[PDB]
Each structure stands twice: as C-alpha cells, then as structure tokens.
C-alpha cells in the first residue's frame, strides 16, 4: 500500500508512505537480535572515510540467515516483520525441531506458508537449493558468490537475479544491474523475488525524513571555496571546470573498475 | 577443398540488387559472387540479366568441394527470381529440388507509411 497524505502542512504535502498492514506490530524476536552501534562514517582511524553518514534513529540488528544451511527440516512462516537494517522485509520462521530464524521475505509468502532448503526441498518461493538444481530461467534472490559464504547478490527490496545458462560447472546469471556473470554452480540461491518492491515508490517529502534515516546534508563543490574542493570558488555563481570528485578524479564517464582477478567472471557488463 | 558433390544454393532476390550464395546440405556456406559490385551497380543491376551473370560468377567460383547438384531455395520478389536457376541448370548442376523461403507473416509487424513517388 502506498498513500499520498493531504497537505495538512508543507512537507507533509509531498509525502508518500509505504504502509504494510501485515508487518507485525510490536517488538521483534529477542533472541535473534544483537546491538548495532552507529559510526558517523568514521573508521577505526577516527577520520570521516564516508561522509553524509550519522545521526538518526536507533537500530537493533536482526540476525538473518543468509546461508540457509540447515537442509531438510521444514520451517513455517510465523510472521512478517519490519527491518530497520535494510529495505527488504524479513520473516521469523519456525523450523519443526524448534529452531527459529529470520529470512529475507520474498514477494510471495505470508503467515503459515511452509518453506525449506536442501538438495531437493521442493521448489517454491522461500526455498533454497544449489543452482545445480534450479531450472534455468528460474527467478531467484539472495544468491551466493562462493558456496557456503552466504547470500550476497540481489538482496535489496524487490530485487532479483534470473539464471540464464549452465555452460558446464559454473552457471551464467544476469543481475538487473544488467550484467551477466558466470558463477560456481554449487552456490545456493532462494526462489522468488525479494521484499516489498513497493519500496522505491516512497517519496520522503521533507528534510527530516532523511535525517532520521541516517543521512546528512550534501554540500556542493561550488557552494565551497577553492581551498575546499576543486569546483573552486566563484565571485557569484561560476564554474568552468571539468567535473571532478573533491579529491581530483573526474566524475562523469571516468570508469574506475580494477580487479582482473574477477574479470574472468564478468561476461557482459551493465549498460 | 574436401569435395562433397552434394550441396545447395541459397538465392536472395531482394529486388534492388539481388544476390545468390551456395552452401552444403545442413547449411554451411561457400560462395557469394553477386549483382552489385560486379557488372555495374545501380539501376542496371536488379535486372534479370544481371541475375543470370550473378549466377555465373557464383558458378565460376563455387566449384571444388565436389558440388554436381544442389537444392535451390529462393528468397525474393522481382527480377532474378527465376533467371538464376535458369542459368544454374545450364552450367550443369543437377537441379535436385527448389523451394520457397520468402518470409510471410500472419500479419505480424507494422510496415512503413507514406510513399508516393
């Protein structure tokens, strides 16, 4: 559900909420979460390594199962929960032995849906197999890069990879980054698309929306003086410079990939 | 080359410049020679005669690899449709079979609007 909220006040006027009515109202499952302290975007050194980061709400880490290593054992979707730590939504599952876990909720499921994992383990949304066991063309999320190394690929809300070949011992797959890229095929993956793909329909609507999301004012390079940034000073709104990061490198066009150790896995790269 | 003797000639009569190639049974390929840059170029191609001679220069280079026959499927409307085969069976290839391959939709894609000369 997306809502537009009326212009009761500016910066409500442009707001647009994503309201999920079967997201469990209340407190998440205690034993599956641990503390998670903010950074400011400052590294062990103390300096700002990444900027725009800091301030905004408290946020307890939910430990989601990115591996789905326990094969066999059915598990049942007890409830869907809100997750601060990511756009995606999670699902508190109950394995029939009594174990409990969190999993990246896919487009499909709801309460009571059964799910499981393993070299067979059905083949519906919510179920995880090695890709050496998923049909080509099949639509998947939470893909592994190295087997046993948990999911890394296509995890964001409403995101997905489709497998698209098999080529032997790898298995070429295309990520709606646009890139097709071979990968060892014992690498697992969960059936379905992930999360509320509605995510991107939000609008935020005011400044503070962003502040309590963690993010912080971005100051232009021309708003500054020439000692602060290469977009120089001015004397009344001026430029005449080849756009560039504060540290001197071109922005716009300047390809900056370097990793030949993996260039053996890219096959067609985004456009 | 390696000499089969059994092959096929794929002929494309687009109209405006009309062309012919030859291949093997499962459809590999070995020889164009074609009306365009080959005995004029311009309105004096797209003539049946030019298809004749377009078949000849094909012939005069599509030998070797055996060939002493060929299946002959044909793509096009207009000049060069027949006159090639007419010169093919005259150069002494046993005209095994002929075929239509001109693509006909079950009206599928829009074609291009407004053209009065």
């Amino acid at each position: 559900a997306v809502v537009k909220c009326k212009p009761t006040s500016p910066g409500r006027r442009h707001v647009v909420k994503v309201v999920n009515p079967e997201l469990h109202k209340g407190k998440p499952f205690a034993p599956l979460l641990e503390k998670n302290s903010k950074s400011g975007g400052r590294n062990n050194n103390g300096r700002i390594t990444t900027r725009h980061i800091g301030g905004g709400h408290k946020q307890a880490y939910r430990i989601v199962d990115f591996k789905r290593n326990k094969d066999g054992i059915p598990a049942v979707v007890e409830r869907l929960e809100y997750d601060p730590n990511r756009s995606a939504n999670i699902a508190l599952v109950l394995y029939k032995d009594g174990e409990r876990r969190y999993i990246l909720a896919p487009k499909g499921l709801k309460a009571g849906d059964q799910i499981q994992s393993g070299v067979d383990a059905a083949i519906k949304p919510g179920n995880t197999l090695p890709m050496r066991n998923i049909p080509v063309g099949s639509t998947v999320h939470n893909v592994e890069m190295k087997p046993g190394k948990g999911g890394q690929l296509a995890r964001s809300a409403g995101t997905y990879v489709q497998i698209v070949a098999r080529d032997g011992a790898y298995v070429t797959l295309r990520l709606r980054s646009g890139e097709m890229r071979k990968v060892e095929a014992d690498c697992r993956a969960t059936l379905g698309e992930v999360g509320n793909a509605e995510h991107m329909l939000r609008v935020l609507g005011k400044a503070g929306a962003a502040r309590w999301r963690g993010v912080r004012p971005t100051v232009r390079g021309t708003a500054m003086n020439p000692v602060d940034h290469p977009h120089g000073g001015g004397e009344g709104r001026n430029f005449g410079k080849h756009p560039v990061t504060p540290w001197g490198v071109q922005t716009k066009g300047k390809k900056t990939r370097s990793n030949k150790r993996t260039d053996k896995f890219i096959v067609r790269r985004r456009s | 080359r390696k000499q089969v003797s059994d092959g096929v000639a794929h002929i494309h009569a687009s109209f405006n410049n009309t062309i012919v190639t030859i291949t093997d049974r499962q459809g590999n390929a070995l020889g164009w020679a074609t009306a365009g840059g080959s005995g004029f170029r311009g309105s004096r191609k797209s003539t049946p005669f030019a298809a004749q001679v377009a078949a000849e220069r094909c012939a005069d280079a599509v030998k070797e690899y055996g060939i002493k026959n060929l299946e002959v499927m044909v793509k096009g409307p207009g000049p060069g449709r027949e006159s090639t085969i007419r010169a093919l069976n005259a150069a002494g290839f046993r005209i095994t079979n002929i075929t239509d391959v001109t693509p006909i939709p079950h009206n599928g894609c829009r074609p291009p609007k407004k053209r009065r000369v």
Partner: protein
C-alpha cells in the same frame, strides 16, 4: 513452395507457379499500412466484381 517434381527434363515447371502465396501476399504485407482503404479495396474489388 517446396517442389521436387519427378524426372527427365529441366523446365522450372508449374503453370501453377503463383501457387498459393509469394508475389501477391508479399505486395500486401510489404507496401505499408492501410486500415481504411482495404475497405475501399473492398467496395471496389466487389462493387465492380459484381457483373
């Protein structure tokens, strides 16, 4: 379309050459659009093809 015909001669054969298709259905499908004038083609190709 696919023609094989039997035995001794060379003649490309067929006074049934314009068999089912080519020349004609290629003009139509080729030229361009229509929609209103196949209706005029209609009440002419059988406003005349009465007697």
């Amino acid at each position: 379309i696919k023609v094989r015909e039997n035995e001794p001669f060379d003649v490309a054969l067929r006074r049934f050459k314009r068999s089912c298709e080519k020349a004609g259905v290629l003009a139509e499908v080729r030229r361009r659009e229509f929609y209103e004038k196949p209706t005029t083609e209609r009440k002419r190709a059988k406003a005349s093809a009465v007697k």
